[PDB]
């Protein structure tokens, strides 16, 4: 990656160099549909539904 932050002087003022991480951003979504029923089926217990 290289050094462009002058880490020695930064370390002298209490900023110690830590881990170097990659940069990952979401893209190219895969679309799938699904049905969600918000009301349950109570046919087998219809007598107590009221």
């Amino acid at each position: 990656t290289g050094g462009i932050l002058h880490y020695e002087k930064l370390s002298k003022i209490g900023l110690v160099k830590g881990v170097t991480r990659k940069y990952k951003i979401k893209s190219n979504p895969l679309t799938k549909d699904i049905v969600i029923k918000m009301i349950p089926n109570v046919s087998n217990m219809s007598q107590c539904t009221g």
Partner: nanobody
Amino acid sequence: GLVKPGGTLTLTCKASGFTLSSYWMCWVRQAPGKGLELIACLYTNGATTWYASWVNGRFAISRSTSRNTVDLNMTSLTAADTATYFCARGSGSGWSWFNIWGPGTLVTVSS
């Protein structure tokens, strides 16, 4: 039992073995020598009602909610409306089979 074609009639449930408001309640009709036909149910809340496709507002259910009765109102009666009208309790608060059948009230349209 007596009624005139085009007249009106009001019936009442004669089950009287329980609190009527806590049970599912339909009105079942049966023409003489014909099959049983379901007319109209009434939910325990008392506002929501179920009706067969053929009634089309001709019949109406209500409950006295004080005398523990349930009524059925009829209008524009014809010869086909001659039947025995059964008040059937339905085992539970909600939709269900009937395990208690009322004695029924004979109804005769005729000049």
